[PDB]
Amino acid sequence: GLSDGEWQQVLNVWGKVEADIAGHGQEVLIRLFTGHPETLEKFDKFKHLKTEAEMKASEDLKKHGTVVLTALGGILKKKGHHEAELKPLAQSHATKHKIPIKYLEFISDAIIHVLHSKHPGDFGADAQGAMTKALELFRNDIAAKYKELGFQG
Ligand code: HEM
Ligand SMILES: [O-]
């Protein structure tokens, strides 16, 4: 898992996100949808967003980015002890939303990108390593639940 030091870096980075949760969440989803338009198709409520300008102008997209990063933050603050928090998300994303684990890889990559973009020169090599490890742990634990359920997508 992650060391004590590594969790400290994760939660330090997370403080940056928390100062503007909606702004970070918006930019994460925009990066996901523009880089991987197939992901937009999983959201009936964002399918009407035909341009990045429309995406930026959508208050509902910001609202969802808030929901998404708030959930992730709750999970990260558990420092790996997140079975209760993670299980329902795994189950809704596999059985209801039909989200392949590839799409979680995409959003993980989008979070790293957004952190650099919003905090250029203030997201150090150690911090990137730690955040990357935490997102991998999150994805790996979801993947285990996906395997239980026989879900591929
Ligand atoms: C950091 C990873 C993610 C987190 C923490 C997360 C969290 C959430 C939460 C808390 C909800 C609302 C409750 C629920 O339905 O379980 C939700 C809904 C949803 N999620 Fe995610 N999600 C993540 C990644 C993704 C990805 C990558 C996609 C698609 C590419 C996706 C698709 C959806 C959809 C389609 C909904 C329902 C949206 C609606 O209200 O119409 N999720 N997610
Ligand atoms: O989501």
CB–CB of 62/26 below 8 Å? yes
Q: Is 64 annotated as a binding residue?
A: yes
Cα four-point dihedral sign 37, 109, 54, 74: positive
Q: How was this structure determined?
A: X-ray
CATH number of 1-153: 1.10.490.10
What are the structure tokens assigned to 114, written together?
């957004």
Nearest Cα to 2, choosing from 126, 147, 143?
126
Domain limits, the chain: 1-153
Give the count of beta carbons closer than 10 Å to the beta carbon of residue 62.
20
Is residue 113 marked as binding?
no
Q: Which residues line ligand 1 (CB under 6 A)?
A: 39, 42-43, 45, 67-68, 71-72, 89, 92-93, 97, 99, 103-104, 107
- Give residue 130 CA to ligand 1 midpoint distance, Å: 23
For tokens 């999983």, name the residue.
Answer: 42
Atom of ligand 1 nearest to the CA of 104: 27
Q: Tokens 């998404």 appear where?
A: 68
